[PDB]
Amino acid sequence: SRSVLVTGASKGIGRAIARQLAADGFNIGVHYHRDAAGAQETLNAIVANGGNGRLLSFDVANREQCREVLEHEIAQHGAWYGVVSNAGIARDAAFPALSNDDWDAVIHTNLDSFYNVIQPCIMPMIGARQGGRIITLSSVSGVMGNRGQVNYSAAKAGIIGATKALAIELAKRKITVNCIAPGLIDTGMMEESALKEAMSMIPMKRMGQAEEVAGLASYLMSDIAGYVTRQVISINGGML
Amino acid sequence: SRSVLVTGASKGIGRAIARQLAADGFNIGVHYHRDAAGAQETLNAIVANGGNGRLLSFDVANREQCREVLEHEIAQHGAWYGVVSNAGIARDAAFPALSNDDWDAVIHTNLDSFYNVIQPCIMPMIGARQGGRIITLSSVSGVMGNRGQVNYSAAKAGIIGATKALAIELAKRKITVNCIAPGLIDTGMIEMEESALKEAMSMIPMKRMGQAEEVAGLASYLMSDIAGYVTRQVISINGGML
Amino acid sequence: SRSVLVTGASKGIGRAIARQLAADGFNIGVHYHRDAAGAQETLNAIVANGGNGRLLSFDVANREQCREVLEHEIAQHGAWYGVVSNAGIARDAAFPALSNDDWDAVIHTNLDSFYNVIQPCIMPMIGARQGGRIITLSSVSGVMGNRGQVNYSAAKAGIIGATKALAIELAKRKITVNCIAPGLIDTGMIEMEESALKEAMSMIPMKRMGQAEEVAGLASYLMSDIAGYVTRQVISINGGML
Amino acid sequence: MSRSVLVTGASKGIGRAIARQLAADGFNIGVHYHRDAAGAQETLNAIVANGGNGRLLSFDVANREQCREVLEHEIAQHGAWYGVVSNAGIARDAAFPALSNDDWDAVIHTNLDSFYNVIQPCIMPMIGARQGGRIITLSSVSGVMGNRGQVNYSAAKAGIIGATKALAIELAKRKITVNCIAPGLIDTGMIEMEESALKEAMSMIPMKRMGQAEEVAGLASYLMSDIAGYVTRQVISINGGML
Ligand SMILES: NC(=O)c1ccc[n+]([C@@H]2O[C@H](COP(=O)([O-])OP(=O)(O)OC[C@H]3O[C@@H](n4cnc5c(N)ncnc54)[C@H](OP(=O)(O)O)[C@@H]3O)[C@@H](O)[C@H]2O)c1
Ligand SMILES: NC(=O)c1ccc[n+]([C@@H]2O[C@H](COP(=O)([O-])OP(=O)(O)OC[C@H]3O[C@@H](n4cnc5c(N)ncnc54)[C@H](OP(=O)(O)O)[C@@H]3O)[C@@H](O)[C@H]2O)c1
Ligand SMILES: NC(=O)c1ccc[n+]([C@@H]2O[C@H](COP(=O)([O-])OP(=O)(O)OC[C@H]3O[C@@H](n4cnc5c(N)ncnc54)[C@H](OP(=O)(O)O)[C@@H]3O)[C@@H](O)[C@H]2O)c1
Ligand SMILES: NC(=O)c1ccc[n+]([C@@H]2O[C@H](COP(=O)([O-])OP(=O)(O)OC[C@H]3O[C@@H](n4cnc5c(N)ncnc54)[C@H](OP(=O)(O)O)[C@@H]3O)[C@@H](O)[C@H]2O)c1
Numbered sequence: 001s002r003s004v005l006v007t008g009a010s011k012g013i014g015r016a017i018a019r020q021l022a023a024d025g026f027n028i029g030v031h032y033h034r035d036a037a038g039a040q041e042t043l044n045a046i047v048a049n050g051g052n053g054r055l056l057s058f059d060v061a062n063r064e065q066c067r068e069v070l071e072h073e074i075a076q077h078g079a080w081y082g083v084v085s086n087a088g089i090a091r092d093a094a095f096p097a098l099s100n101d102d103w104d105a106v107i108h109t110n111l112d113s114f115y116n117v118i119q120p121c122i123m124p125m126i127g128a129r130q131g132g133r134i135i136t137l138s139s140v141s142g143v144m145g146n147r148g149q150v151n152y153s154a155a156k157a158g159i160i161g162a163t164k165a166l167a168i169e170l171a172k173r174k175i176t177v178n179c180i181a182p183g184l185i186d187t188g189m190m191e192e193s194a195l196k197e198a199m200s201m202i203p204m205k206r207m208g209q210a211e212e213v214a215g216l217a218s219y220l221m222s223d224i225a226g227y228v229t230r231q232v233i234s235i236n237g238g239m240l
Numbered sequence: 241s242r243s244v245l246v247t248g249a250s251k252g253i254g255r256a257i258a259r260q261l262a263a264d265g266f267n268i269g270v271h272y273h274r275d276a277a278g279a280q281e282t283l284n285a286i287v288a289n290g291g292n293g294r295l296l297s298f299d300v301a302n303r304e305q306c307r308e309v310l311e312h313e314i315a316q317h318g319a320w321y322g323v324v325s326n327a328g329i330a331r332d333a334a335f336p337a338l339s340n341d342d343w344d345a346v347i348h349t350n351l352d353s354f355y356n357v358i359q360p361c362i363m364p365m366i367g368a369r370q371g372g373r374i375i376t377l378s379s380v381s382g383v384m385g386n387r388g389q390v391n392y393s394a395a396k397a398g399i400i401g402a403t404k405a406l407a408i409e410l411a412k413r414k415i416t417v418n419c420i421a422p423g424l425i426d427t428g429m430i431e432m433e434e435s436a437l438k439e440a441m442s443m444i445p446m447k448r449m450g451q452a453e454e455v456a457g458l459a460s461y462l463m464s465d466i467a468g469y470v471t472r473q474v475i476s477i478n479g480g481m482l
Numbered sequence: 483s484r485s486v487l488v489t490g491a492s493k494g495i496g497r498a499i500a501r502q503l504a505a506d507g508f509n510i511g512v513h514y515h516r517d518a519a520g521a522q523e524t525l526n527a528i529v530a531n532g533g534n535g536r537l538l539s540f541d542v543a544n545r546e547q548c549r550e551v552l553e554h555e556i557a558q559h560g561a562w563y564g565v566v567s568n569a570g571i572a573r574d575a576a577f578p579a580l581s582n583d584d585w586d587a588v589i590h591t592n593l594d595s596f597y598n599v600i601q602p603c604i605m606p607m608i609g610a611r612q613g614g615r616i617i618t619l620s621s622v623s624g625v626m627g628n629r630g631q632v633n634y635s636a637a638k639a640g641i642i643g644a645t646k647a648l649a650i651e652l653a654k655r656k657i658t659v660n661c662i663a664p665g666l667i668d669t670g671m672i673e674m675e676e677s678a679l680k681e682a683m684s685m686i687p688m689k690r691m692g693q694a695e696e697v698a699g700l701a702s703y704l705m706s707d708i709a710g711y712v713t714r715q716v717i718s719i720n721g722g723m724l
Numbered sequence: 725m726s727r728s729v730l731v732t733g734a735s736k737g738i739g740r741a742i743a744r745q746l747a748a749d750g751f752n753i754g755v756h757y758h759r760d761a762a763g764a765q766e767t768l769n770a771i772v773a774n775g776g777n778g779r780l781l782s783f784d785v786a787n788r789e790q791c792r793e794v795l796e797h798e799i800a801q802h803g804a805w806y807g808v809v810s811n812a813g814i815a816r817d818a819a820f821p822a823l824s825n826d827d828w829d830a831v832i833h834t835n836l837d838s839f840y841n842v843i844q845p846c847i848m849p850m851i852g853a854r855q856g857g858r859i860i861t862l863s864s865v866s867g868v869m870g871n872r873g874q875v876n877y878s879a880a881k882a883g884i885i886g887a888t889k890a891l892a893i894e895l896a897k898r899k900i901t902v903n904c905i906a907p908g909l910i911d912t913g914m915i916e917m918e919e920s921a922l923k924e925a926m927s928m929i930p931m932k933r934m935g936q937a938e939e940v941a942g943l944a945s946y947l948m949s950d951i952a953g954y955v956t957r958q959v960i961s962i963n964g965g966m967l
Binding site: 649650653654665687688689692693695696699700702703706708709710711712713714715717718719720721722723724 | 892893896897908930931932935936938939942943945946949951952953954955956957958960961962963964965966967
């Protein structure tokens with residue numbers, strides 16, 4: 001039984017990833033920040049479909065809380081086989097109007113979470129000797145940049161760099177490290193004007209669904225994907 | 241029943257792709273150039289595992305033959321749902337030593353095959369209105385270049401450009417078009433001394449070659465219904481080379 | 483002192499590159515295919531500004547003619563220090579409507595020219611021991627793909643792959659090999675209706691076409707002595723398109 | 725119009741070389757330093773001795789308030805910068821599981837937060853001056869491809885690339901270009917390697933040598949020039965063919 005931590009599994013892409021990986025047979029750490037009810041709904045659906053998992057909670061910007069909860073989880077249940085670092089936020093504004101909090105909240109939550117969430121999981125993953133899987137969530141904005149989102153583009157591009165560097169370090173230990181960069185996905189995470197501009201750049205002329213992102217995570221998590229590492233794979237309807 | 245043409249299915253990556261997609265439930269056009277016995281072995285294994293397929297043959301450098309065989313196949317059996325353009329060759333030498341035939345054979349076979357194989361399949365795929373899948377095989381040398389292979393790097397990079405452009409054209413028709421760029425994969429194509437193999441391994445963080453089956457797993461994902469929003473991509477399966 | 487061959491120097495980007503590099507002090511091989519008058523105009527402007535150069539001609543799709551002319555030029559004048567492989571064409575159509583000639587003319591002219599033009603220049607460039615510069619012209623379509631241009635995207639992406647591979651081979655010999663990928667540049671190559679131009683502009687953050695002279699400024703940088711550590715790169719000059 | 729260019733980390737290495745080259749090109753240089761005042765003065769002395777102009781200034785790029793205060797004062801006193809070269813950076817290497825809190829935070833705060841801290845105060849004035857402008861950031865090959873033992877540095881430097889691209893799109897209509905230079909291995913004080921480690925690094929560089937600071941400065945000079953007005957949103961790598 002291999003366990004997979006999915007951050008932000010209370011809704012959207014994280015929920016869809018949690019459901020799919022549970023169906024694949026992984027035991028899921030259904031993580032949430034504040035939306036306990038949403039996480040329980042995710043878990044209920046996992047269980048009702050014959051899968052297994054459990055709830056856990058932490059703020060990915062809170063380093064100490066991440067370390068404490070994760071060390072406790074690992075002591076009680078053993079090392080994670082997989083870690084899907086999905087939780088993220090956006091705080092959009094034109095660059096010259098971006099507040100201190102807009103910048104810091106996005107960098108601290110989206111980028112520092114790489115260190116806060118993943119670092120406590122690594123030595124135990126290595127210690128278990130089953131190999132492993134690390135999957136991060138970036139964004140097309142991290143690959144190409146996006147107007148009104150200098151902070152988000154920075155954080156999400158930073159995730160890509162972290163992911164690539166860690167891939168090289170862990171390659172000999174049979175742990176793959178990859179990044180999924182979704183384009184525009186239909187979730188709770190913008191104006192009609194902005195949506196139109198986004199659509200015009202999407203050859204498929206539609207948003208992706210959370211379940212489609214989950215299908216890619218399912219592939220990367222599978223045993224047959226063991227030679228895929230250090231990659232950013234974009235699921236974006238042909239945007240780039 | 242959706243059919244998938246797999247070029248170069250008589251050995252190596254093409255064989256592995258053929259087997260995997262057959263197991264996924266696709267009816268396979270098991271293509272070969274000259275290795276009929278190899279293609280039959282691929283098909284026998286497909287059938288023995290409860291799948292379906294048929295043999296067909298053409299030179300991917302021979303435009304007229306490709307059109308003739310493919311039009312006949314489509315008239316007799318209906319449009320392909322998927323096309324995996326896998327057939328390829330290498331003719332390595334230092335750039336100043338590369339012969340006319342070294343350059344032309346690699347460009348004509350690897351790059352012109354995009355047009356020769358894929359063009360006859362497109363209007364029928366559109367006409368069938370089931371959407372579709374096009375998967376091309378490039379290489380890490382097409383992404384980053386490789387010494388002693390200016391011809392192969394050129395052809396393989398050209399496949400990437402063709403793939404991306406066609407992706408944009410076919411997006412509204414629910415046909416995805418993607419490229420797989422393997423790194424070093426353990427097949428009959430690769431013939432290296434121990435010294436050369438060590439040099440190659442030093443650039444691969446995983447310190448091993450890929451297996452044909454691993455490349456087939458990625459083709460299987462791209463072929464699946466859940467991958468309908470993935471298009472215009474080059475996905476590299478290379479043990480972390482880049 | 484140091485000579486630079488600029489293919490397609492009779493108009494557009496090649497002319498602008500020829501003029502700029504001549505102003506930088508390079509002796510220019512002002513190449514043309516059929517537009518002798520245009521090449522002479524380029525040369526007259528070079529000379530009038532205190533620079534030097536000479537006319538030469540060949541079809542970059544004609545391998546034998548390229549070798550013959552270039553071997554003669556090199557025997558008579560010595561090795562080129564730089565080669566700017568700029569000549570190119572487009573033959574646009576939707577992929578299923580692309581004729582045999584549309585595909586072949588674009589691949590043969592744009593991609594085979596890498597081999598036909600550059601190969602005869604390499605051993606002499608090495609033999610001269612002055613180091614060197616090779617600059618190819620690709621396109622944003624070669625980086626990202628472009629609808630209605632599967633052939634051009636393929637050829638231009640192939641140029642990138644060739645360029646990267648040759649860069650690795652020549653690095654120890656102090657010859658840099660790089661690719662310039664312009665976006666939309668205001669030359670005779672571009673023929674768009676007002677409607678099509680607006681669609682193109684909407685994807686360009688700078689909301690204007692580039693000028694040939696801007697592309698020439700980048701070539702001037704890559705040709706300069708201070709750029710000796712830049713190799714294996716595709717540099718895009720495209721107003722922020724990507 | 726004498727055009728001024730701020731060069732962070734101009735007291736040594738790449739920043740010094742950029743400062744010298746852009747001064748020779750005719751730009752008035754803000755020769756920035758953090759703690760190495762003597763080094764910055766030597767950069768400025770060489771600028772002046774060669775017939776150029778510039779002035780010293782100082783701030784910690786991790787200190788947001790100090791950056792805003794100094795830069796607003798500089799802009800009030802001398803007018804808007806035409807160019808900003810965000811060059812200052814550090815490395816704090818260790819294997820990912822051994823990386824300390826300070827190793828991670830110092831690299832992210834200094835290398836990535838500096839984009840916001842240094843560049844934001846310069847933008848509205850640059851726009852207000854109506855001369856267009858140039859923003860050049862310094863990333864690294866490790867930001868493009870990742871590098872073992874540097875998950876923090878790779879993250880920060882890749883983050884700079886993303887910030888650079890996004891800002892390029894915002895400022896394109898205002899004739900301010902925004903680009904990133906990603907050097908490979910450059911011979912400065914930042915690099916401290918044993919002979920063994922140097923050999924391993926060289927094996928990945930087709931040119932089999934380190935770059936020189938002056939070479940990086942040549943690329944900055946091109947991007948700063950008027951003829952480079954259509955080049956924006958790019959990461960240009962100067963790395964001897966590494967990638
Ligand atoms: N949607 C898109 O179009 C899109 C595009 C590109 C990339 N992405 C990336 O994909 C990931 C998920 O996106 P999504 O649209 O599914 O997000 P979403 O629906 O907005 O959900 C965000 C999730 O992250 C959690 N979260 C937010 N702040 C947190 C914090 N400080 N600590 C811990 N968890 C926190 C939330 O938990 P609670 O509800 O419990 O607070 C929630 O489950 C993000 O990294 C995002 O940047 C999304
Ligand atoms: N192996 C690697 O390391 C590697 C790495 C990156 C990319 N690739 C690419 O992956 C693809 C498959 O490679 P592989 O190693 O599986 O090759 P392989 O084992 O050598 O198989 C080559 C296949 O291509 C077919 N073929 C060759 N010339 C042909 C022609 N003119 N017309 C039609 N078919 C032709 C062959 O048919 P017959 O045997 O019937 O003659 C054979 O089935 C190629 O495109 C290759 O460039 C391979
Ligand atoms: N304009 C753009 O927006 C744009 C964008 C991206 C890339 N590019 C690339 O930039 C390069 C130059 O483009 P341009 O816009 O300056 O084109 P142009 O104005 O159409 O000039 C084309 C040049 O190519 C030469 N040429 C054409 N066919 C040839 C052949 N078979 N053999 C030898 N020479 C041949 C022509 O010679 P004659 O005049 O003697 O016939 C001419 O000098 C091309 O490689 C093109 O693909 C252009
Ligand atoms: N050298 C390489 O191989 C290489 C490769 C890729 C990228 N880079 C990048 O190139 C840039 C310059 O590198 P370099 O090798 O020239 O570095 P260097 O010789 O270490 O010089 C570093 C400069 O950064 C300044 N600095 C450091 N921390 C600072 C802070 N908190 N606030 C303000 N300024 C600070 C220093 O100021 P004081 O001296 O006054 O303290 C110094 O002038 C960096 O961003 C680096 O990451 C270097």
